[PDB]
Design a binder for this molecule. Structure first.
Ligand SMILES: *[C@@H]1O[C@H](CO[C@@H]2O[C@@H](C)[C@@H](O)[C@@H](O)[C@@H]2O)[C@@H](O[C@@H]2O[C@H](CO)[C@@H](O)[C@H](O)[C@H]2NC(C)=O)[C@H](O)[C@H]1NC(C)=O
Ligand SMILES: *[C@@H]1O[C@H](CO)[C@@H](O[C@@H]2O[C@H](CO)[C@@H](O)[C@H](O)[C@H]2NC(C)=O)[C@H](O)[C@H]1NC(C)=O
Ligand SMILES: *[C@@H]1O[C@H](CO)[C@@H](O[C@@H]2O[C@H](CO)[C@@H](O)[C@H](O)[C@H]2NC(C)=O)[C@H](O)[C@H]1NC(C)=O
Ligand SMILES: *[C@@H]1O[C@H](CO[C@@H]2O[C@@H](C)[C@@H](O)[C@@H](O)[C@@H]2O)[C@@H](O)[C@H](O)[C@H]1NC(C)=O
Ligand SMILES: *[C@@H]1O[C@H](CO)[C@@H](O)[C@H](O)[C@H]1NC(C)=O
Ligand SMILES: O=c1cccccc1O
Ligand SMILES: [Zn+2]
Ligand SMILES: [Zn+2]
Length: 446
């Protein structure tokens, strides 16, 4: 979402989000760090290719051709500089000159020491309470963004972790068609299409970087949850990490975990989808979680089996037409979980990633809310590790990631919505250890 210095009347009217780095001559003298060599203000490239017919409302949604409905000029950085004003470094690099390499290791959360587990939990809890230094979130769509009087930007501050929740919400929210009309919901800029894995990859990368800055620990890394154990229970739902079940309400988190104190954002779909507003930073109810608790649905009462992961990693094509939740023999659709682990589509089956969400039978298994449950982080780093292992095994073959006719938001050159600065699926479709500054300490079934 947008840098706080671009969430202004002036930037929104100029169409330019090219903030100063730190200037030596007045405002606007160091846009994008052009006074050093770090970058320059340029016209943004957004994907212009056609999408699948499933979305019939071109012209109606701010997420189309992201970010062109808000800005048409942004910072393009030189070399291995990066960031909204080119003031930081590309993934894998540090130093004032972005020339020292860093490789952090994402580890199984259960393999961490006692103090590392406690450090992780406290860091998450700190991220939930600490204001994001850079980004603010819109509470209104683009026509109402400058407020009732036209001079009051409708943006709020938000914590580092709630920004993580909000961006996921925004990628899945329904298209608002107007007061009195039913919002359109067969749209999803981050699920049910090729962009699913690269979207969630950047999602994690952005949270990890914000927490590194927040902790001033450049090597801080996010652990993972191997949910592919076939278990009846959530083996990370203990009070020293992520929280066990409350003995006073089977759907709440134990009061002996800090996560029982968390309150969720974005739980007012009734307001957003009838008034045309957006999720704001005001929190509401507690996390609901009831692992294996969905008695109405026995197939989401057990986590995936270890051979489900080994089978989905045999699927050698990243995606297949129609690049949607009913693709067959699609690695993306298999690990997302709409196919069985062999690649066969079946509308009645939930597996791998989808199954892990639904297993939680609560906040973590509702699409507009699921990052509110911090198990989301660990669930998706494991999903990302499977993706990365696939990238290594099939030499990151992006040829099947479609350029056209994917569901809207899922064309290969689409800037993943609503991430800032603009970043395409292509930029995430690379093996992580040599291109993004992280790797997984993990072993695969075999
Ligand atoms: C780049 O953007 C400027 C500013 O317009 C804003 O850009 C978008 C975010 C969109 O939401 C517009 O409504 C914003 O006003 C463009 O210049 C404006 O062009 C419009 C025509 O649509 C005109 O009515 C305004 O008077 C213009 N304002 C200014 C300050 O020039 C500009 O055309 C865009 N350049 C492109 C697209 O190449
Ligand atoms: C932030 O979001 C909440 C939830 O949509 C808004 O609160 C609701 O406002 C409507 C209409 O004003 C009420 O009918 C609901 O009862 C409210 N819900 C709750 C839980 O209070 C709130 O107004 C939003 N804030 C801003 C600044 O837009
Ligand atoms: C968690 O699982 C329970 C089932 O164990 C869900 O509650 C059921 O919801 C279905 C669908 O609406 C109803 O037909 C049943 O009558 C409900 N049963 C009970 C006991 O409430 C619940 O919706 C699930 N929650 C989430 C977030 O997935
Ligand atoms: C948002 O909050 C602003 C505060 O800005 C700064 O944000 C972080 C880094 C904290 O350290 C905080 O203490 C800082 O002062 C306020 O100035 C303002 O009320 C808010 N702005 C908007 C646009 O909502
Ligand atoms: C997949 O879903 C789309 C959208 O409804 C449909 O048009 C298409 O025929 C489906 N493909 C199948 C079932 O193979
Ligand atoms: O990807 C999801 C799948 C199923 C349920 C809830 C939330 C999700 O983000
Ligand atoms: Zn998701
Ligand atoms: Zn998910």
């Amino acid at each position: 979402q947008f840098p706080r210095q671009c969430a202004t009347v002036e930037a929104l009217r100029s169409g330019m989000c090219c903030p100063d780095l730190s200037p030596v001559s007045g405002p606007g003298t160091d846009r994008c760090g052009s006074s050093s060599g770090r970058g320059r203000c340029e016209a943004v490239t957004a994907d212009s290719r056609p999408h699948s017919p499933q979305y019939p409302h071109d012209g109606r949604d701010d997420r189309e051709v992201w970010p062109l409905r808000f800005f048409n000029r942004t910072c393009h950085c030189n070399g291995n500089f990066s960031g909204h004003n080119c003031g930081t470094c590309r993934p894998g690099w540090r130093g004032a000159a972005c020339d020292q390499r860093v490789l952090i290791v994402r580890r199984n959360l259960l393999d961490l020491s006692k103090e590392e587990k406690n450090h992780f939990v406290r860091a998450l809890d700190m991220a939930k309470r600490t204001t994001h230094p850079l980004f603010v979130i819109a509470t209104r769509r683009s026509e109402e963004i400058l407020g009732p009087d036209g001079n009051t930007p409708q943006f709020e501050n938000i914590s580092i972790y709630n920004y993580f929740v909000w961006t996921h919400y925004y990628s899945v929210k329904k298209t608002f068609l107007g007061v009195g009309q039913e919002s359109f919901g067969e749209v999803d800029f981050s699920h049910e299409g090729p962009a699913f894995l690269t979207w969630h990859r950047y999602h994690l990368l952005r949270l990890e970087k914000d927490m590194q800055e927040m902790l001033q620990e450049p090597s801080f890394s996010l652990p993972y949850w191997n949910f592919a154990t076939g278990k009846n229970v959530c083996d990370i739902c203990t009070d020293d990490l992520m929280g066990s079940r409350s003995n006073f309400d089977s759907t709440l988190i134990s009061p002996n975990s800090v996560f029982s104190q968390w309150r969720v954002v974005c739980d007012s779909l009734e307001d957003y989808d009838t008034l045309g507003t957006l999720c704001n930073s005001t929190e509401d109810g507690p996390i609901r979680r009831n692992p294996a608790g969905n008695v109405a649905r026995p197939m989401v009462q057990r986590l995936p089996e270890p051979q489900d992961v080994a089978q989905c990693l045999e699927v050698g094509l990243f995606d297949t037409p129609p690049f949607y939740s009913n693709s067959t023999n699609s690695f993306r659709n298999t690990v997302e979980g709409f196919s069985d682990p062999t690649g066969k589509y079946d509308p009645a089956v939930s597996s791998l990633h989808n199954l892990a969400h639904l297993f939680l039978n609560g906040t973590g298994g509702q699409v507009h809310l699921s990052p509110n449950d911090p198990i989301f982080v660990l669930l998706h780093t494991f999903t990302d590790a499977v993706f990365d292992e696939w990238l290594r095994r099939y030499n990151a073959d992006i040829s099947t990631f479609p350029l056209e006719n994917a569901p809207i938001g899922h064309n290969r050159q689409y800037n993943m919505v609503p991430f800032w600065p603009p970043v395409t699926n292509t930029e995430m479709f690379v093996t992580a250890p040599d291109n993004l500054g992280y790797t997984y300490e993990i072993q695969w079934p075999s």
